[PDB]
């Protein structure tokens, strides 16, 4: 079903907090600074601000893909 506006706002704040904590623990060595979540029709863009973007992406983007999949698996967004 659907939940109330109060619960929805508290929930997306909770999601943002957990996402930021995980990204911190994962990319502290790469100069992680923050995450911005942008919700657009049928898509959610997660911008990761880091000093070393190449290390965050990894070789051929592998690392970033891993991160995406992990987010996909954790918070249950549609594949």
């Amino acid at each position: 079903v659907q939940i109330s506006k109060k619960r929805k706002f508290v929930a997306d704040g909770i999601f943002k907090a957990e996402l930021n904590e995980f990204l911190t623990r994962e990319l502290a060595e790469d100069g992680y600074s923050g995450v911005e979540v942008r919700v657009t029709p049928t898509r959610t863009e997660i911008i990761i601000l880091a000093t070393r973007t190449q290390n965050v992406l990894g070789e051929k983007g592998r690392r970033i893909r891993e991160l995406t999949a992990v987010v996909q698996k954790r918070f249950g967004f549609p594949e």
Binding site: K5, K6, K8, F9, V10, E36, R38, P41
Partner: protein
């Protein structure tokens, strides 16, 4: 939305409380239009943080 908590992680000292707050503002707009024009207006790259829900009455 209000949450009042004890400041300390323990139970020691003068009893001080944090009074946290969240504020949710809600706006309603009603317009007479075909759905296509409504879709054109809604998708205008709105500012982040604002949730928009279009409903047909």
């Amino acid at each position: 939305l209000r949450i009042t908590t004890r400041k300390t992680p323990c139970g020691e000292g003068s009893k001080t409380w944090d009074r946290f707050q969240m504020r949710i503002h809600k706006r309603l707009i009603d317009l007479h239009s075909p759905s296509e024009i409504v879709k054109q207006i809604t998708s205008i790259s709105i500012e982040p943080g604002v949730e928009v829900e279009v409903t047909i009455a």
